[PDB]
Structure 1
Amino acid sequence: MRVTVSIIKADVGGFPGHAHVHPKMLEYAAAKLKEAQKRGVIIDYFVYNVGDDISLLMTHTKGEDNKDIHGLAWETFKEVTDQIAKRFKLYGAGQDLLKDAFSGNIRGMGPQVAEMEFEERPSEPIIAFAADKTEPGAFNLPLYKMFADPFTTAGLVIDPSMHEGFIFEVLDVVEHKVYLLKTPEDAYSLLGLIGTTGRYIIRKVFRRADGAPAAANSVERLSLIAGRYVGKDDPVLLVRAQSGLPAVGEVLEAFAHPHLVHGWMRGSHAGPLMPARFISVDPERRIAIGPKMTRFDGPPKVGALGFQLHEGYLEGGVDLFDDPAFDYVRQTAAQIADYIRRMGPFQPHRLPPEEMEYTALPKILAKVKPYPADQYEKDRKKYIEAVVK
């Protein structure tokens, strides 16, 4: 049968600050989705956080961009906001609900969406990812690696079924333009775009052999929605695995280097992306509690839950960063975080001026006496003597 897998995610309040979610928010969301399942709106679901972001993973047969699914998520977020976040006066209550009026699609309103629709395969393993304290382009390097780097994905070389490569759908979020680039041949041009992680984001990946959907990344940029910094984007990502798609382990290998990503404190820094364990996973209650954000509101973290689909039912989730091999990766991230923080507010630890334009900093800087440089050279001695006296 054909199934749609949708992740719709939002921050509707933190506990405390931006560190985490309140567990009653997850319980409320799970109860609401259980009711939707009973009414036949969805087939199955799983609710989980990473940091202060709540992901609603839903399987259904309504297709992508469906108003009922998108609306169910919106309503769930609004009810969590009103019933839980406002009640406990959580920080950033309703943070990502950036627009008032739901008119059918949740894109552009603040919540993140990643979805794919496909014929369910004879085995259908999928991985759901969620990151906090970063942007959607944080997934650019992992997505490139798992679909186009033969040092990551051995299948590109050694599995005859994969050797034709992949099609990357890249969104320019500034000019609202889409690029379609094919690996291996277009790898260099692809990289020239997606290395600019804040602008050119991999949104979807398709297999070249047949066009099958392979991955879907959420591309909402909160600062472009709001016109100012109101949070990190905090993306979600779906990847289908195996059988001419990257193995589960090839997908995970793509996260084994905890690369520097943009976000962290105040949406204004760069730090390592730590692949983190969940605190708890409860398959029967359909809830997982992900990691906290601590020093400097991070470091940024990503969680990975694996599932097997059957008739759209979700067996899972399985925490796929739960291995002593990944402890080494977490330790690296911890040490890199310490190293880079000693830079304080200097680029490249602090972000470039184009992202700083969304913060209050240009404000502040607009008290302050420039002097024209040519004239200043003549006057330097008198200006210095004025400061001295």
Structure 2
Amino acid sequence: MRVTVSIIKADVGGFPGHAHVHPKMLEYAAAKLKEAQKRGVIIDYFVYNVGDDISLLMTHTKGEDNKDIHGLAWETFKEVTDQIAKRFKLYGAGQDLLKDAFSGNIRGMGPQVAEMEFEERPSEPIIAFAADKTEPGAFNLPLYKMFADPFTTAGLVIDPSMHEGFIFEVLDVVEHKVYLLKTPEDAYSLLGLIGTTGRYIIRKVFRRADGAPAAANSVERLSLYVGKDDPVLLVRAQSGLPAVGEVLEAFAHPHLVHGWMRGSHAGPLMPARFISVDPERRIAIGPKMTRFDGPPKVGALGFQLHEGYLEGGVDLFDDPAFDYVRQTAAQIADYIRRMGPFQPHRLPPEEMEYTALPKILAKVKPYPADQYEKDRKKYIEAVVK
């Protein structure tokens, strides 16, 4: 049977600040999706946060870009906002709900969507990722590695079934143009684009052999505001797609990503454990953001699908081998924070979410550099006097 797997994610209020969510928000959302499942709107679901972002993972058979599934998520986030976030005056209450009225598609209204529809395989392992305090381009490096780096994914070399490579759908979120690039042959052009992680973002990946969907990352064109929102990512694994371990090895170097405090810094992406995972209640509580509102973290939950039911989730960063990677991230976060307000720890001026540069340039007197050069002595004496 064909099944659609959809993650729709929003931040509708933090607890406190942007550090985490209130657990009643997850409880409320899971009860609301349980009602939808009882009415047959969806097959199954799982609700979890990383940081202050709540992901609703739903399986159903309504296809991609479905108004009832997008509406179901919109209504769930709206009811969490009104019943829980506003009641407790949580910080950024209703943050991502950027219009008053659901139009039919949630995309572009602030919440993030990653969805894929496909024929469910004889075994259908999937991993759902959620990252807080970063941008969709944070996943460009991991997605490149797991589908195209032979130092990550051994199947590309030793699995005759993966030898043909993958097709990357890259969105330029500035000029709203899509590029299709095929690895291995296009690897250098692909990297020329997706190295600029705030502009060219991997949105989908397909298998070259048959066109099978292999991953979907939440990204939308930029709007004024919308589009740097913390991402979610779905990846299908095994049987000609990277193994669960190849997918996870792509996160084993905690690379620098853009986001962290005020959406205006670079820090390491720490692969973090969930605080708790309750497969019966369908809820997992992810990690907090603490120093400097981070560092940015990604959680990974694995599932096996059957007739669209989700058995899981399993926390896939829960291994002492990943504690080495967390320790690396914690040490790099301390090193780079000693740079304070300077690039490249602070982001390039086009890329920062916060700036006071207008206020500064309104108050600080400029001198044409040619004129200034003749009168430097006079200008300095003025300041000294």
Structure 2 length as normaliser, TM-score? 0.98
Give the aligned partner of residue 19 of structure 2.
19
Partner SS, residue 48 of structure 2: strand
Q: Tell me if 1:172 matches 2:172.
A: yes
Q: Per-residue CA shift, 1:229-262, capped at 9, x if unaligned?
A: 5895110000000000000000000000000000
- Taking the aligned partners of 2:320 and 2:304, their CA distance within structure 1 comes to 23
Give the aligned partner of residue 214 of structure 1.
214
- Taking the aligned partners of 2:25 and 2:8, their CA distance within structure 1 comes to 15
Q: 1:172 touches 1:199 (CA, 8 Å); kept in 2?
A: yes
Instruction: Report the CA distance shift for 1:355/1:26 in structure 2 as closer, same or farther (over 3 A).
Output: same
- Taking the aligned partners of 1:364 and 1:9, their CA distance within structure 2 comes to 36
Instruction: Report the CA distance shift for 1:127/1:110 in structure 2 as closer, same or farther (over 3 A).
Output: same
- Taking the aligned partners of 1:141 and 1:188, their CA distance within structure 2 comes to 13
Q: 1:135 touches 1:221 (CA, 8 Å); kept in 2?
A: no
Q: 1:5 touches 1:57 (CA, 8 Å); kept in 2?
A: yes
Q: 2:174 touches 2:199 (CA, 8 Å); kept in 1?
A: yes
Q: Which moved more, 1:363-372 or 1:252-261?
A: 363-372
Flag as ranges the 4+ runs of structure 1 deviating above 4 A: 221-224, 229-232
Q: Per-residue CA shift, 1:124-151, capped at 9, x if unaligned?
A: 0000000000000000000000000000
Q: 2:47 touches 2:283 (CA, 8 Å); kept in 1?
A: yes
Q: Per-residue CA shift, 1:146-191, capped at 9, x if unaligned?
A: 0000000000000000000000000000000000000000000000
- Taking the aligned partners of 2:121 and 2:69, their CA distance within structure 1 comes to 23
Instruction: Report the CA distance shift for 1:370/1:357 in structure 2 as closer, same or farther (over 3 A).
Output: farther
- Taking the aligned partners of 1:232 and 1:52, their CA distance within structure 2 comes to 15
Q: 1:133 touches 1:232 (CA, 8 Å); kept in 2?
A: no
- Taking the aligned partners of 2:161 and 2:227, their CA distance within structure 1 comes to 41
In the alignment, which of 327, 331, 350 is matched to residue 331 of structure 1?
A: 327
Q: 2:263 touches 2:354 (CA, 8 Å); kept in 1?
A: no
In the alignment, which of 293, 317, 322 is matched to residue 318 of structure 2?
A: 322
Partner SS, residue 102 of structure 2: coil
Partner SS, residue 351 of structure 2: helix
Q: Tell me if 1:343 matches 2:339.
A: yes
Deviation of 1:102 after TM superposition, in Å, equals: 1.2
- Taking the aligned partners of 1:99 and 1:275, their CA distance within structure 2 comes to 33
Deviation of 1:364 after TM superposition, in Å, equals: 3.4
Q: 1:265 touches 1:296 (CA, 8 Å); kept in 2?
A: yes
Deviation of 1:99 after TM superposition, in Å, equals: 2.1
Superposition map of 1:267-346 within 5 A: 267-346=263-342
Q: Which moved more, 1:113-122 or 1:359-368?
A: 359-368
Q: 2:136 touches 2:231 (CA, 8 Å); kept in 1?
A: yes
Instruction: Report the CA distance shift for 1:218/1:46 in structure 2 as closer, same or farther (over 3 A).
Output: same
Deviation of 1:365 after TM superposition, in Å, equals: 3.2
Structure 1 length as normaliser, TM-score? 0.97
Partner SS, residue 350 of structure 2: helix
Give the aligned partner of residue 69 of structure 2.
69
Instruction: Report the CA distance shift for 1:232/1:298 in structure 2 as closer, same or farther (over 3 A).
Output: farther
- Structure 2: 5+ residue runs without aligned partners? none
Instruction: Report the CA distance shift for 1:4/1:30 in structure 2 as closer, same or farther (over 3 A).
Output: same
Q: 2:127 touches 2:300 (CA, 8 Å); kept in 1?
A: yes
Q: 2:48 touches 2:55 (CA, 8 Å); kept in 1?
A: yes
Partner SS, residue 70 of structure 1: helix
Q: 1:262 touches 1:271 (CA, 8 Å); kept in 2?
A: yes
Give the aligned partner of residue 41 of structure 2.
41
- Taking the aligned partners of 1:370 and 1:188, their CA distance within structure 2 comes to 43
Q: 2:125 touches 2:305 (CA, 8 Å); kept in 1?
A: yes
Partner SS, residue 9 of structure 1: strand
Q: Per-residue CA shift, 1:315-334, capped at 9, x if unaligned?
A: 00000000000000000000
Partner SS, residue 250 of structure 1: helix
In the alignment, which of 217, 237, 244 is matched to residue 240 of structure 2?
A: 244
- Taking the aligned partners of 2:380 and 2:196, their CA distance within structure 1 comes to 42
Give the aligned partner of residue 5 of structure 2.
5
Q: 1:274 touches 1:301 (CA, 8 Å); kept in 2?
A: yes
Deviation of 1:368 after TM superposition, in Å, equals: 1.9
Instruction: Report the CA distance shift for 1:231/1:384 in structure 2 as closer, same or farther (over 3 A).
Output: farther
Q: Per-residue CA shift, 1:201-231, capped at 9, x if unaligned?
A: 000000000000000000036765xxxx589
Deviation of 1:366 after TM superposition, in Å, equals: 3.5
- Taking the aligned partners of 1:92 and 1:290, their CA distance within structure 2 comes to 19
Deviation of 1:98 after TM superposition, in Å, equals: 1.4
- Taking the aligned partners of 1:29 and 1:239, their CA distance within structure 2 comes to 23
Q: 1:222 touches 1:233 (CA, 8 Å); kept in 2?
A: no
Q: 2:262 touches 2:353 (CA, 8 Å); kept in 1?
A: no
Q: 2:174 touches 2:222 (CA, 8 Å); kept in 1?
A: no
Q: Per-residue CA shift, 1:338-374, capped at 9, x if unaligned?
A: 0000000000000001023763433333402000000
Q: 2:81 touches 2:93 (CA, 8 Å); kept in 1?
A: yes
Deviation of 1:30 after TM superposition, in Å, equals: 0.1
Q: 2:110 touches 2:227 (CA, 8 Å); kept in 1?
A: no
- Taking the aligned partners of 2:357 and 2:228, their CA distance within structure 1 comes to 17
Q: 1:221 touches 1:233 (CA, 8 Å); kept in 2?
A: no
Partner SS, residue 223 of structure 1: coil
Partner SS, residue 92 of structure 2: coil
- Taking the aligned partners of 2:256 and 2:6, their CA distance within structure 1 comes to 27
- Taking the aligned partners of 2:288 and 2:361, their CA distance within structure 1 comes to 33
